[PDB]
Design a protein around this nucleic acid. Structure first.
Ligand code: FES
Ligand SMILES: [K+]
Ligand SMILES: [Mg+2]
Ligand SMILES: [Mg+2]
Ligand SMILES: [Mg+2]
Ligand SMILES: [Mg+2]
Ligand SMILES: [Mg+2]
Ligand SMILES: [Mg+2]
Lengths: 86, 135, 97, 100, 137, 49
RNA sequence: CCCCACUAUGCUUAGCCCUAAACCUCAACAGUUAAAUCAACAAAACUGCUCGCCAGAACACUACGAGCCACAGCUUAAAACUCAAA
């Protein structure tokens, strides 16, 4: 309200491609968490519920990052069978 | 008649005991050999347990005095562009050649570390060795 | 006993610990140029340490410095000051197209 | 005057090498599967390197090659595991062929 | 010169122009995309109103107002009244995640206006009023 | 029906070194074929189904 | 349950009230990782020491008594009848 305008959350259109400009803006707002933030703010999430979801989200990321690391590590041996017949 | 309780004693103790009790009519072919030449440890099932608190494995890291010289040489001059040949059991790398000269000069009475390291590089350069400082 | 036995000592080949780009440097709330490198250009959102690569100590100093600078009249809140858009990009975040 | 094991270990090239990361070593191709080269370089485990695009036909069984070592054994401990998972192979980058 | 998605900063000397007008002089199309309605106002750089259209003013009622095609129709209507006043290039400022968020911009283009930038101004409180309680559905 | 012969003698020793696999004939063939593939490396439709 | 409106209330001040699935459902302190690893599950299994607490279910976060700025309150807290389970 007191800040300068047409700087925050502003994307310029290139060659009249408004669809690509809108997708870039939507990607910007998504990556910064603004879209999910706006959605969670439509109804009041109670503190006990917010902590539970934040705890679930943090533990799911760790498990998914750890499960990706395991699959990457155990995919080195996906090469063809070197000892076929034995 | 026998015993498949592999977690109760060892094959020797179970066989010896059942032979004494008369359950086994004949001793197995291996029993006399085991008795004459037993293993260092009697093979008894054990459950591996996990260490907790202040319990730590007794295995010690293997280090040598020359390893301090090797760390500095790799820091100062990096790994030699010459390739290690780990198949030849008498292979000598540029670092090992540096370490041997560094040890010889130390035995000549020199005790300073920073001075004993610079004189060693000069000796090798005189011998024709290529020592390109990393930085 | 034997000369060739291993000897007890500390690892001579141990490498130094990693350091964040700001390890050993004072983070001042008046240094808005530095602080702006850790906020979103479009929204002004402070980046998490997984994007900035900062350690816990410097991530906290940067956060506290940003919050102090914003409300004292040194730094905008809703966007990165456009003067600092051409500074070195030290954050692992890819935005445009 | 029989050499002791402690003596053999101190003066072994593998011991003298120190850390294996970023060490140039000479390997030997002993097994090939399509474009997968199995190379022994004097360690416990072999490394597996893909046939280079350039001079691919020069890499055959018995060909000696230059490697840049990264790890002697690829192992990692994953969450909820009491031990380390090992793939039973070393990590190395194939640079080229060794010639005299 | 390479394309910059960052808007030109006022007070600096840029080379970009639209019909001889600088970025600071291009009129602004303000789109309020609500969950049940879409409102579009075109204003000049001096804050002079030029055209207004919403789904309600275009004959849509009740749930039909909360559709993309309703917002698209409102955009065309606002473009027509704005084009008569001399508007070609507009800066789009959309606030809200309603169904007419993107469709309202489409109608502005079909109506003869050229969009040079897109700005989101959806209100996000930084801590603000307590929203209504969650719904049991 | 063809009957497989005894696979050990009077002393109880099996004749084939792969007896304890339970599939000595199958695994003996796989061993012979795998060995031939090795020797080749060291050295180097319509009418049939 | 869904939609809209609005009040006590959520806020500040000064007094009260003293309850929570007040829950890591893990008492405080010290020590051990060798023994049998260990009903099950949870959260690997135990030792020393101390305080608090418990002794079938239900009756019962109840009655009576007592104390309390509490007066439709809180704390402490039974019995009879009943059952062969809980
Ligand atoms: S790593 Fe040292 S302060 Fe960040
Ligand atoms: K709990
Ligand atoms: Mg609590
Ligand atoms: Mg206590
Ligand atoms: Mg009872
Ligand atoms: Mg109660
Ligand atoms: Mg009561
Ligand atoms: Mg009473």
């Amino acid at each position: 309200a007191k800040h300068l305008k047409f700087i925050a959350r502003t994307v310029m259109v290139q060659e009249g491609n408004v669809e690509s400009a809108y997708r870039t803006l939507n990607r910007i707002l998504t990556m910064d968490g603004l879209i999910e933030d706006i959605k969670h703010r439509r109804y009041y999430e109670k503190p006990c519920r917010r902590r539970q979801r934040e705890s679930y989200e943090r533990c799911r990321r760790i498990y998914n990052m750890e499960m990706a690391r395991k699959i990457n590590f155990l995919m080195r041996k996906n090469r063809a069978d070197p000892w076929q017949g034995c | 008649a026998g015993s498949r309780l592999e977690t109760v004693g060892s094959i020797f103790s179970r066989t010896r005991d059942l032979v004494r009790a008369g359950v086994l009519k004949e001793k197995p072919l291996w029993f006399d050999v085991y008795d004459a030449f037993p293993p260092l440890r009697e093979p008894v099932f054990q459950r591996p347990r996990v260490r907790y608190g202040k319990a730590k494995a007794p295995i010690q890291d293997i280090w040598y005095h020359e390893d301090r010289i090797r760390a500095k040489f790799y820091s100062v001059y990096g790994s030699g562009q010459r390739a290690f040949d780990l198949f030849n059991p008498n292979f000598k790398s540029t670092c090992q050649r540096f370490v041997e000269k560094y040890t010889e000069l130390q035995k000549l009475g020199e005790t300073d570390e920073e001075k004993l390291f610079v004189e060693t590089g000069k000796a090798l350069l005189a011998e024709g060795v290529i020592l390109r400082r990393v930085g | 006993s034997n000369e060739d036995l291993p000897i007890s000592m500390e690892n001579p080949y141990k490498e130094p610990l990693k350091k964040c780009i700001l390890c050993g440097k004072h983070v001042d709330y008046k240094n808005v140029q530095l602080l702006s490198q850790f906020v979103s250009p479009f929204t002004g959102c402070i980046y998490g340490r997984h994007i900035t690569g900062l350690c816990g100590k410097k991530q906290k100093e940067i956060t506290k410095a940003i919050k102090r600078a914003q409300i004292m009249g040194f730094m905008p809140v809703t966007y990165k000051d456009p003067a600092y858009l051409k500074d070195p990009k030290v954050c692992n975040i890819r935005y445009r197209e | 005057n029989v050499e002791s094991f402690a003596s053999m270990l101190r003066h072994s090239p593998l011991t003298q090498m120190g850390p294996a990361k970023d060490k140039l070593v000479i390997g030997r191709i002993f097994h090939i599967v399509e474009n997968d080269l199995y190379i022994d370089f004097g360690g416990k485990f072999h490394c597996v390197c893909r046939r280079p695009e350039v001079d691919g036909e020069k890499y055959q069984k018995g060909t000696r090659v230059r490697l840049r070592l990264l790890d002697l054994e690829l192992t990692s401990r994953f969450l909820g595991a009491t031990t380390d998972t090992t793939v039973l192979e070393a990590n190395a980058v194939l640079l080229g062929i060794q010639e005299s | 010169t390479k394309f910059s998605i960052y808007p030109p900063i006022p007070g600096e000397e840029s080379s970009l122009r639209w019909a001889g007008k600088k970025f600071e002089e291009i009129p602004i199309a303000h789109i309020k995309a609500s969950h049940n309605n879409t409102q579009i106002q075109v204003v000049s750089a001096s804050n002079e109103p030029l055209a207004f259209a919403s789904c309600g003013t275009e004959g849509f009622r009740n749930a039909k107002k909360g559709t993309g095609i309703a917002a698209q129709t409102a955009g065309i209507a606002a473009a027509a009244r704005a084009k008569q006043k001399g508007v070609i290039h507009i800066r789009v400022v959309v606030k809200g995640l309603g169904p007419g968020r993107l469709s309202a911009m489409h109608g502005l283009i079909m109506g003869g206006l050229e969009v040079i930038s897109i700005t989101d101004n959806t209100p996000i409180p930084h801590x603000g009023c307590r929203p209504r309680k969650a719904r049991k559905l | 029906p063809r009957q497989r012969a005894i696979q050990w003698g009077e002393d109880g020793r099996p004749f084939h070194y792969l007896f304890y696999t339970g599939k000595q004939s199958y695994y003996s063939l796989m061993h012979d074929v795998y060995g031939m593939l090795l020797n080749l490396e060291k050295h180097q439709v319509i009418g049939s189904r």
